[PDB]
Symmetry: C2
Subunit: 393 residues, 2 copies
């Protein structure tokens, strides 16, 4: 009656028999759709059928992707966009208007922060940052203006978690809509809608695709809210249309999601256990260490601690630089959730422009490096981090 996650990630919403027996669904790389009669055309520009009209909407390969993602997240409806920024700008452009306020997690993915403060925030929308695990600080931050609560969990830099059920309880008192960016965990590890959130966004560019070869975004949620985001945010405000080709490749990626995430976590579990014992290392942030400040809440929301690790080297910027340069298997790159392991050191990379004090107000430590642990053999990954730690001294 109710098939497993792995079954649904492979099968949900598709029966080969409905499409000439094709085991893999054919790709609708088409811009436009045609009508058998003008009477048939007339029905599409109001709505009654659930058919197809124009690939900026109603494409069957996008439709399948959306249904499958909605199934996995446990939500009513899905929407596929050209990037994770597309998913979030479409969502927020449709939910907010001048004078509305959005409450934010204290830290956010860089471009998201840029969107809020330098984009929509410059159009009369109000922004407040608050710690989304501190339920009393949140209740006290609610105002009649508050219309959206938006955060990632876990969040860069320190993998800080939100209490999603608690946020939802507070939001429901004020009618506010809770949006969670679930990029890090994926629906395999965490399902925020089952915990009370109204909408989830994904940069499918990362773990969902898993292979570093597409940019894509996903939104899942209630049908009324998803419809408006499709018909307003996507169609009119953004034009962040997902290629059917990239959509097909994303679905191909999703068929191994459970497998890849088990391995991302198992690899990160050993590296974290290793890193936590090293002398070059003052601090580690990894949800599956007993020492993780929100260890308990982590275990309540996530079925596994994930593939990302953040840590701080004794020795600041110079140690970070030395560590990064010596790496031979990990690549120096931004991004995460690929088969290949990646590392970044923000103080010398993404945030090298500013100086020691400005990086502090953002919680970006001078020695902070972040690993996206991939799928390579751990012995190889271990050796690589080891010699790099040796080089950092």
């Amino acid at each position: 009656k109710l098939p497993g996650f792995a079954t649904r990630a492979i099968h949900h919403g598709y029966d080969p028999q409905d499409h000439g027996g094709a085991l893999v669904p054919p790709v609708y790389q088409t811009a436009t759709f045609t009508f058998p009669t003008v009477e048939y055309g007339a029905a599409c520009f109001a709505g009654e059928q659930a058919g197809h009209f124009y690939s900026r909407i109603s494409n069957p390969t996008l439709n399948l992707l959306e249904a499958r993602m909605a199934s996995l997240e446990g939500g009513e409806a899905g929407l596929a966009l050209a990037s994770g920024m597309g998913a979030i700008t479409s969502t927020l452009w449709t939910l907010l208007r001048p004078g509305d306020e959005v409450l934010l997690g204290n830290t956010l993915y860089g471009h998201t922060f840029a969107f809020l403060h330098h984009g929509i925030g410059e159009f009369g929308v109000k922004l407040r940052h608050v710690d989304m695990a501190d339920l009393q600080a949140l209740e006290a931050a609610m105002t009649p203006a508050t219309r959206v609560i938006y955060f990632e969990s876990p969040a860069n830099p320190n993998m800080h978690m939100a209490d999603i059920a608690g946020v939802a309880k507070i939001a429901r008192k004020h009618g506010a809509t809770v949006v969670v960016d679930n990029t890090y965990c994926t629906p395999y590890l965490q399902r925020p809608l089952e915990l009370g959130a109204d909408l989830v966004v994904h940069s499918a560019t990362k773990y969902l695709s898993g292979h570093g070869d597409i940019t894509a975004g996903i939104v899942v949620g209630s049908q009324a809210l998803v419809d408006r985001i499709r018909l307003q945010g996507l169609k009119d405000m953004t034009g962040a249309v997902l290629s059917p080709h990239d959509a097909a490749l994303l679905m191909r990626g999703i068929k191994t999601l459970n497998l890849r995430m088990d391995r991302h976590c198992a690899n990160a579990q050993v590296l974290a256990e290793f890193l936590a014992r090293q002398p070059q290392v003052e601090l580690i942030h990894y949800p599956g260490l007993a020492s993780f400040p929100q260890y308990t809440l982590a275990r309540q929301q996530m079925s596994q601690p994930g593939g990302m690790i953040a840590f701080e080297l004794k020795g600041g910027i110079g140690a970070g630089r030395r560590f990064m340069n010596a790496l031979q298997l990990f690549s120096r790159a931004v991004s995460l959730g690929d088969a290949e392991s990646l590392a970044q050191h923000p103080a010398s990379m993404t945030h090298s422009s500013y100086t020691p004090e400005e990086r502090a107000h953002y919680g970006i430590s001078e020695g902070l490096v972040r690993l996206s642990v991939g799928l390579e053999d751990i012995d190889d990954l271990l050796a690589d981090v080891q010699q790099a730690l040796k080089a950092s001294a």
Copy 2:
């Protein structure tokens, strides 16, 4: 001499690419990669500071997109190009970038439906002031200018009546008062009309249409000055829109552009013959094609466009009624909305797009009850004449 600009077809095929820089690959390899890596954290640092040239992350820059961009720039005669997920991606990333609350944008009298919706229900609801003016009436435009006027935005020819504006005249007014001129050049492509060479600051394209030519991708393009395109790339696209073009689709777009001059020659030659034939048919009350002397702006068309395009609009004798009959009788033209495909398209807004209404109405927007729009494609002209001939008879 060698300071001579290569021809348009030469540039559409070769501009910005030399096989010898990629191991002799005749066709550029497709950079289907979300991210790029760094040799050191210094070379990586230098690429968030503006010292070194290179690649951050495919949402901001990518070699396949870059070549498409430089090539579209060359063709429009602009400094810099930007490739996006759709035409609306191009339009929204440009407008979100250039406009803030308190600013006014002056708009052509009619627009593409989603552009109109974007303006009125989107950015217009965020404190941006909108005013429509007839961009053909240079005196009215000049009179509408205020110190708040920040952008002037229009299509030429415009959806849906093929109304034209004097691009050079609009540019002259804009330079005296200080507004940025953005022109949607979808209908013409740079092969037929180059608004930037006429003084526009920016042009936008739905490359989904003629640039692609084969109706298999969605894409948008912006061309203009290096400074404006950089700003749009770094604010509109990257933060405000996320309308990222797939490198696969961008390769396909470049493949389309290699035949643009050839396809457009044929769209125009076909539409010219169709239009003259339709002008002479008993059932046709009215016809708009820029290649006919009866086109209200015949003279502006022939001054701005090297050829008159592949779109025809025409009214049938009879009403709503006669459209349905004509449309439903077509066997070769497809009933569809869109344009610039290899295949011929027809739409009868009365019984299709705008069917939610009544005989009254649409007048608000100014649309006839026997009005049909054709996107003339690349099929044999005799088969296209035969299809509309047999369908006109059915419409009686």
